[PDB]
RNA sequence: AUAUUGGCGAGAGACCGAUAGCGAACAAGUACAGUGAUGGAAAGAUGAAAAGAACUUUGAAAAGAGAGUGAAAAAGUACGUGAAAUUGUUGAAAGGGAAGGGCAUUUGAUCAGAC
RNA sequence: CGUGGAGGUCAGUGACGAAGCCUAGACCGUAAGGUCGGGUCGAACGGCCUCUAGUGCAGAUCUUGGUGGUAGUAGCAAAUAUUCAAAUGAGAACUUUGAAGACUGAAGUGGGGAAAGGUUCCACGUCAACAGCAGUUGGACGUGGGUUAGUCGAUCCUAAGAGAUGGGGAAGCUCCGUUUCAAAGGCCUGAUUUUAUGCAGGCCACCAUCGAAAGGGAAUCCGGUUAAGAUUCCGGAACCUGG
RNA sequence: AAACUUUCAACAACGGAUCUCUUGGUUCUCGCAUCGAUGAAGAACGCAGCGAAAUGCGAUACGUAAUGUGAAUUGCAGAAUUCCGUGAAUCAUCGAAUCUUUGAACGCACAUUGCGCCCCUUGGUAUUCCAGGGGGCAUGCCUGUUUGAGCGUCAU
């Protein structure tokens, strides 16, 4: 039992370093956002305030 | 060289067949030679290994020791002979995994099926 | 451990039904014990015994129905042979070998001969 | 939604029975590569979509 | 107010679970699945989407009956049983 | 479930999902040889079915619970 | 393979102030979305003059 | 198991653990625990907590009333045992294990193995053979795997 | 006699070698996203064998220091080899509003050949 | 000059250490580069004569991965507010109880529900990660328990509407239409005694079906009870439909 | 003089290149012809002595039967008819079966675990009310059978 306990503690280390709040937290960030890195700004209507 | 069109000399295929062989194929993959005495007695060179045979270790660090087979671990591709173990200072004793091709059978476990198998391979029984 | 089918084949219908209800009672009390203990290795043997008894009863009834329909046209569809749908729809050997009288007389009169050139 | 259908309640029951960590005797098997449950679900983390 | 305040009024549903394909693509007002085409008799698939055909084709499920046809063919669609003892 | 036995002659069983109240009453009378007053049922959040079977006052659920064999 | 480096859906975002004009994978929520595609200088794209 | 030469039985004597306390939910469990705490620090049978015990006659109505009392007391003891307020005292059988079997078969973790599923801890934290490195769980597995036992 | 990027069974190569080769060498059309049609990843290597560090001691503990297993922990489930950017410690040096370079020699340190 | 593979040769190098990597050491070439020593490492690799190519990077607002300076910096300032003792614990601005001061102010920071979520409810154990300070605490982590109906809803009815059949279009996937240009279906009396139900001897105008958890609609109240359930359980007292 | 900045060397970090590997891919050649109303492909929900997947299977549920082999499976438990055997086993083979709810999906309907009718049987005093068990009831078309319709029409 303590062997398998030490196994699980050594296995959760990299997830802990990526700061996931469990094995069910699997939020994936995109590489680039289109609304942040596309378009130009003119003299008319704009996209954000 | 090979001549048949059904044999393959492909390393990838041979390694996949060995590592995904089932249990009844692993039985024939784990075969062990006989001693010179049993060879001259029976007329057989090698046999598949069984769980109650008395063997001798002829290769490795434990070369020279004897004992009976205690387990034939077909999943781990190994065999475990009694009285060949590694001991610890807290009193533990783990068994050593040995390959059957580095052993010599000195005495068989003879029943009806093994007698039929030796007569099938063309040996003598008297 | 468990029942053996070659021993079950030497019994009759009410004997197999009695053995079925005994095994069902035993599986019930084993589930009662499993409520308190996680590992009970007899549950597997009792389940395989129940499946074996049911198999033997079904094959006895099906053999009786086959002897009852022996030889007749129009057997039931599960007692009929199942190859494939296309194989069931294809022509038989008789219908495939039906031949016109004109062709039959022609094949009688002039069949293909055997010959050699060499001499 | 406190007044649901049997289909929704059935999928909820399966998703409740699937919500467990890995059993510890599985880690002790020979050549075991499963180190965690990579399909674990949480109610506030990710949604089931009916 | 076309963005985040209007995202708060979002609590109905356009699609529910399908019965043929089980996907949540069944439009409740059209009474049609936008994925498998149910309740039409034919299953919906298009040649401009090859990745979707690859997602839903034969062999992506259990193949409860087709996986034994090759063995039954190789043995010759035999009937009956086997004999014992080689004797 | 233990509290209901010493409360209202009520045994608690897990039943098949395909069974209704008539079948539950008939099976309890067949299996344990008692008389049934009432059957209440629910479907649990883990997907099984649970029945509360209330017996009549000419019978004692404590006796059946001892026979079954968990008390 | 004749379809390698082409089994994806990507479009160029245009002339602007931040990024180069390579076609980029669209979508969301996977880590692949926003990455460059189809070029011989892109990771996962086709090679220059594929072998026939 | 499937062994034919085995005994299957329940113990009849119980032991109160006075260093444990937990308020129970069953009224019969509370009444029975009041009687058990009145009984003392010795092993007791469930028949001794009855009110019809001891017998003042031989008439079988006192037998019937004692059996009805036992039927209620089993329901009480089922919840008293669940919360570790009381433990059973075990039934033993003497049994012989061969020394050559003991010395032939081997343990992977010698000194560090213990039960961890037992409930009494004084069995479970015991070494039968200390200077050979065999624990109680390993000794009972050797006894079960021997045929010459 | 001809066709065959699907299905089943085989044999191969002056092909690729984990950012390559199929999107996928691994529970991959998976996880995740979208109302929906659809979109769609990352992720291989302790050791011959887990023999995966018993025991002592400091610490609330994670751990440290001894000890031990191993051919080797300069192989410790962060595990073959472990480059660069970037960082810490020690030693040497230079520095009155950048640093670096070319030609030439002084000073200090360091070094091969050879008679 | 250099790189990945191929044919030939050196009976080439190699566990007395191959390839790779590091090196204020040595030599050769105008150069591309080649060679030797030392350290690290542990299983393969070269010279020459020829064959072949997915064969040489500083740039492309290049692609993917990694890392800096800025910098212990900007900042962690909406919603009036906290304090004392004890207990627990290795450790308490933040946990628990007690003692005080305040706030929401019944168009509440109270008590219930509908959409939606799905176990978050409750108990026991318990702190690596998360709760932009902390944490012995938690909607976190591990293991379980919990939802009981003749009368409450759904189920039934129809609304705006949707939609088969009979027909008619369309190369076809399918389109129109909802009583239509169709031989469109039931009750029972019969007579009652192969006797059970064939005709009955009169009917039959309407044409499927789907569509409301806020419309229409048969019938239940009080008291008690749990860690968590109740117009459903228990005790008492009613009512409705069908037979 | 230190500190600080920069340069050079040794060691240690950060990071995962290079080298060596490979139960994978890719291309070429050869052989074969076998899905479904006797219910397919696909879907949902279940099932292991102790499993969430992958891989199997259907209330006989990681399987039953038959045939071969001949002593294992293995993390633990457990295997005398597991053992000189009519016999292990996530073994191989596979001809007998089982095959929940669905799906072309077939009594009607389906955002419902909704509503019928017929036949046999068992239990409630019951051809009429209620309940359990078993077996059935789609459409188009072909051949035949039976019962009919029409002054369409022939002989009486
Ligand atoms: Mg989704
Ligand atoms: Mg709205
Ligand atoms: Mg709408
Ligand atoms: Mg209900
Ligand atoms: Mg590529
Ligand atoms: Mg790849
Ligand atoms: Mg990829
Ligand atoms: Mg959204
Ligand atoms: Mg590595
Ligand atoms: Mg190393
Ligand atoms: Mg690292
Ligand atoms: Mg560096
Ligand atoms: Mg190349
Ligand atoms: Mg080369
Ligand atoms: Mg050599
Ligand atoms: Mg070297
Ligand atoms: Mg240098
Ligand atoms: Mg060179
Ligand atoms: Mg060479
Ligand atoms: Mg190139
Ligand atoms: Mg380069
Ligand atoms: Mg570069
Ligand atoms: Mg340039
Ligand atoms: Mg970048
Ligand atoms: Mg500041
Ligand atoms: Mg501010
Ligand atoms: Mg404020
Ligand atoms: Mg505060
Ligand atoms: Mg105010
Ligand atoms: Mg006020
Ligand atoms: Mg008001
Ligand atoms: Mg709570
Ligand atoms: Mg708690
Ligand atoms: Mg915090
Ligand atoms: Mg903290
Ligand atoms: Mg919880
Ligand atoms: Mg229409
Ligand atoms: Mg309706
Ligand atoms: Mg309504
Ligand atoms: Mg009205
Ligand atoms: Mg409540
Ligand atoms: Mg009441
Ligand atoms: Mg499955
Ligand atoms: Mg079927
Ligand atoms: Mg409805
Ligand atoms: Mg006709």
Nearest to H69, CA basis, from H84, H81, H53: H53
Task: Tell me if E21 is assigned to a ligand binding site.
Answer: yes
- Measured CA to CA, the distance from residue B9 to residue B25 in angstroms comes to 19
Query: What are G24's strand-pairing partners?
Result: G11, G36
Question: Which tokens belong to F35?
Answer: 């008389």
Interface test with C, best of E69, E71, E76, E77 (most C CBs within 10 A): E77
Q: What Cα–Cα distance (Å) separates residue D6 from each residue in D42, D48, E14, H39?
A: 22, 16, 20, 54
Give me ligand 30 centre to Cα H17, in Å: 56
- Measured CA to CA, the distance from residue H90 to residue H43 in angstroms comes to 12
DSSP letter string, B57-119: E-SSTTTT-EEEEEEEETTTTEEEETT-EEE-SSS-EEEPPB-GGGEEEEE----HHHHHHHH
- Measured CA to CA, the distance from residue F3 to residue E8 in angstroms comes to 47
- Measured CA to CA, the distance from residue B93 to residue G49 in angstroms comes to 63
- Measured CA to CA, the distance from residue C12 to residue C18 in angstroms comes to 10
- Measured CA to CA, the distance from residue F5 to residue D29 in angstroms comes to 44
Nominal resolution (angstroms): 2.6
Q: What Cα–Cα distance (Å) separates residue E10 from each residue in E5, E6, E7, E46?
A: 10, 8, 6, 32
Helix/strand/coil (H/E/C) assignment for every residue in chain E: CCCCCHHHHCCCCCEECCCCCCCCCEECCCCEECCCCCCCCCCCCCCCCHHHHHHHCCCCCCCCCHHHHHHHHHHCCCCCCCCCCCC
* C-alpha dihedral, E15 to E16 to E17 to E19, nearest 10°: -80
Q: Can you give the length of chain F in residues?
A: 71
DSSP letter string, F2-28: HHHHHHHSEEEEEE-TT--HHHHHHHH
**Residue written as tokens 């209440």?**
F40
* C-alpha dihedral, E69 to E71 to E74 to E76, nearest 10°: -70
* Strands ordered across the beta sheet of E15-16: E15-16, E26-27, E32-33
The structural domains of chain C, with segments of one domain joined by +, span: 1-73, 74-119
Q: Å between H80 CA and J143 C1'?
A: 21
Query: What are G10's strand-pairing partners?
Result: G25
* Beta-strand pair F10-15/F36-43: unpaired
Task: Tell me if E73 is assigned to a ligand binding site.
Answer: no
Q: Å between H3 CA and J50 C1'?
A: 80
- Measured CA to CA, the distance from residue C51 to residue C3 in angstroms comes to 10
Q: How far is C12 from chain F (nearest CA, A)?
A: 25
Mark residue F69 as left, alpha or beta (left: phi above 0; alpha: psi -120 to 50; beta: remaining): left
Query: What are B69's strand-pairing partners?
Result: B81
Q: How far is D40 from chain A (nearest CA, A)?
A: 5
Q: What Cα–Cα distance (Å) separates residue H83 from each residue in B11, H22, H34?
A: 63, 7, 16
Q: In chain G, which residues have their Cβ closer than 8 Å to the Cβ of A31?
A: 31-35
- Measured CA to CA, the distance from residue H98 to residue H45 in angstroms comes to 37
Query: What are E32's strand-pairing partners?
Result: E27
Protein-covered nucleotides on strand J (Cβ within 7 A) = 54, 60-65, 113-120, 128-130, 139-143, 146-149, 153, 162-163, 173-174, 213, 226-227, 232-235
CB-based touch C/A (3+ pairs, under 8 A): no
Please report which residue ranges of chain D form alpha helices under DSSP H. 6-17
In this complex, is the C-beta atom of A39 within 8 Å of any C-beta atom belonging to chain G? yes
In this complex, is the C-beta atom of G30 within 8 Å of any C-beta atom belonging to chain A? yes
Q: How far is B109 from chain H (nearest CA, A)?
A: 19
How much helix, strand and coil, in percent to the nearest 5, is found in chain F?
Answer: 40, 30, 30
DSSP letter string, chain C: ----HHHHTTS-HHHHHHHHHHHHHHHHHHHHHHTT-S--TTHHHHHHHHHHHHHHHHHHHHHHHHHHTTT-SS--TTTS--S-HHHHHS--HHHHS---HHHHHHHHHSPPP---S--
* Beta-strand pair H14-16/H86-88: antiparallel
**Residue written as tokens 């089994």?**
G7
Q: Can you give the length of chain A in residues?
A: 49
- Nearest nucleotide (C1') to alpha carbon of B52: K71
C-alpha angle H6/H9/H11, rounded to 5°? 135
Q: What Cα–Cα distance (Å) separates residue B45 from each residue in B36, B51, B67, C88, H115?
A: 9, 19, 21, 55, 48
Nearest to B49, CA basis, from B22, B21, B68: B68
Dihedral sign of CA atoms D45, D47, E3, E4 in order? negative
- Measured CA to CA, the distance from residue E66 to residue C84 in angstroms comes to 11
Q: What domains sit in chain B, N to C, each tagged with a CATH number?
A: 1-126 (2.30.30.30)
Q: Is B56 within 8 Å of B50 (Cβ atoms)?
A: no
Q: How far is H101 from chain C (nearest CA, A)?
A: 25
Q: Å between F6 CA and J236 C1'?
A: 20
Give me ligand 35 centre to Cα D39, in Å: 28
Q: Is F56 within 8 Å of F24 (Cβ atoms)?
A: no
Please report which residue ranges of A1-49 form alpha helices under DSSP H. 2-11, 13-17, 34-37
Interface list for D 2-41 with A (CB within 8 A): 21, 24-25, 27-28, 35-38, 40-41
Please name the fold of domain C74-119.
6.10.250
Give me ligand 37 centre to Cα E31, in Å: 13
- Experimental determination technique: cryo-EM
CB-based touch F/E (3+ pairs, under 8 A): no
* C-alpha dihedral, G18 to G20 to G23 to G28, nearest 10°: -30
**Residue written as tokens 């113990």?**
H11
**Bond before H54 cis per omega within 30 degrees:** yes
Instruction: Decide: helix, strand or coil at residue D39.
Output: coil
Contacts with H55 (C-beta within 8 Å, 6 or more apart), sequence order: H62
Nearest to G44, CA basis, from G29, G32, G30, G52: G32
Nearest to B72, CA basis, from B88, B94, B53, B86: B53
Q: Å between G22 CA and J55 C1'?
A: 27
- Around Cβ E6, how many Cβ atoms within 10 Å? 9
- Measured CA to CA, the distance from residue E84 to residue B30 in angstroms comes to 29
């Amino acid at each position: 039992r303590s062997k398998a306990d030490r196994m699980a503690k050594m296995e959760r280390r990299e997830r802990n370093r990526h700061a996931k709040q469990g094995e069910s937290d699997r939020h994936n960030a995109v590489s680039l956002s289109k609304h942040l890195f596309s378009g130009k700004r003119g003299v008319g209507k704009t996209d954000f305030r | 060289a090979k001549q048949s069109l059904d044999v393959s000399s492909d390393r990838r295929k041979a390694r996949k067949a060995y590592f995904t062989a089932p249990s009844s194929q692993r039985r024939v993959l784990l075969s062990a030679p006989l001693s010179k005495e049993l060879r001259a007695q029976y007329g057989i060179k090698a046999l598949p290994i069984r769980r109650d045979d008395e063997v001798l270790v002829v290769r490795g660090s434990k070369k020279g020791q004897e004992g009976k087979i205690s387990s034939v671990y077909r999943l781990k591709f190994a065999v475990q002979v009694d009285k060949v173990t590694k001991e610890k200072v807290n009193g533990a004793s783990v068994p050593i995994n040995l390959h059957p091709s580095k052993l010599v059978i000195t005495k068989l476990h003879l029943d009806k099926d093994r007698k039929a198998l030796i007569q099938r391979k063309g040996g003598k029984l008297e | 451990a468990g029942v053996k089918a070659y021993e079950l084949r030497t019994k009759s219908k009410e004997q197999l039904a009695s053995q079925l209800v005994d095994l069902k009672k035993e599986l019930a009390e084993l589930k009662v014990q499993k409520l308190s203990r996680p590992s009970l290795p007899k549950i597997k043997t009792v389940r395989k015994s129940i499946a074996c008894v049911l198999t033997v009863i079904n094959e006895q009834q099906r053999e009786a129905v086959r002897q009852l329909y022996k030889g007749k046209k129009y057997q039931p569809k599960d007692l009929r042979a199942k190859k494939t749908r296309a194989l069931r729809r294809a022509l038989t050997k008789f219908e495939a070998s039906q031949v016109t009288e004109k062709q039959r007389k022609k094949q009688i009169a002039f069949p293909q001969r055997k010959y050699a050139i060499k001499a | 939604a406190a007044q649901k259908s049997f289909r929704i309640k059935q999928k909820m029951a399966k998703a409740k029975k699937q919500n467990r960590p890995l059993p510890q005797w599985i880690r002790l098997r020979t050549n075991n590569t499963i180190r965690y449950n990579a399909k674990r679900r949480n109610w506030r983390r990710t949604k089931m979509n009916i | 107010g076309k963005g985040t305040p209007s995202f708060g009024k979002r609590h109905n549903k356009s699609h529910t679970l399908c019965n043929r394909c089980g996907r949540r693509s069944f439009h409740v007002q059209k009474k049609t699945c936008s994925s498998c085409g149910y309740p039409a008799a034919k299953t919906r698939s298009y040649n401009w989407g090859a990745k979707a055909k690859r997602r839903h084709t034969t062999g992506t499920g259990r193949m409860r009956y087709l996986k034994h046809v090759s063995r039954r063919f190789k043995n010759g669609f035999q009937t009956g049983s086997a004999s014992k003892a080689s004797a | 479930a233990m509290k209901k036995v010493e409360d209202g002659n009520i045994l608690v069983f897990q039943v098949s999902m395909k069974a209704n109240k008539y079948q539950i009453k008939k099976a309890v009378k067949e299996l344990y040889e008692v008389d049934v007053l009432k059957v209440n049922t629910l479907v649990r959040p883990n997907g099984t079915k649970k029945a509360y079977v209330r017996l009549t006052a000419d019978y004692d659920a404590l006796d059946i619970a001892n026979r079954i064999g968990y008390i | 393979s004749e379809k390698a480096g082409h089994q994806t859906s990507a479009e160029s975002w245009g002339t602007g102030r931040a990024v180069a004009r390579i076609p980029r994978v669209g979508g969301g929520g996977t880590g692949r979305s926003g990455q460059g595609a189809f070029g011989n200088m892109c990771r996962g794209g086709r090679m220059f003059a594929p072998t026939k | 198991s499937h062994k034919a030469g085995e005994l299957i039985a329940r113990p009849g004597a119980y032991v109160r653990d006075f260093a444990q306390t937990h308020i129970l939910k069953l009224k019969t469990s509370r009444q029975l625990l009041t009687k058990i705490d009145k009984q003392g620090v010795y092993p007791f049978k469930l028949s001794h907590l009855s009110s019809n015990f001891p017998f003042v006659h031989e008439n079988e109505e006192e037998l019937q009333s004692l059996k009805k009392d036992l039927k209620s007391f089993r329901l009480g003891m089922s919840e008293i045992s669940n919360n570790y307020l009381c433990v059973e005292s075990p039934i033993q059988i003497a049994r012989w294990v061969p020394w050559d079997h003991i010395l032939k078969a081997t343990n992977p973790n010698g000194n560090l193995s213990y039960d961890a599923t037992s409930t009494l801890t004084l069995p479970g934290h015991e070494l039968p053979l200390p200077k050979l490195g065999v624990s109680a769980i390993k000794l009972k597995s050797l006894m079960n795997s021997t045929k010459e036992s």
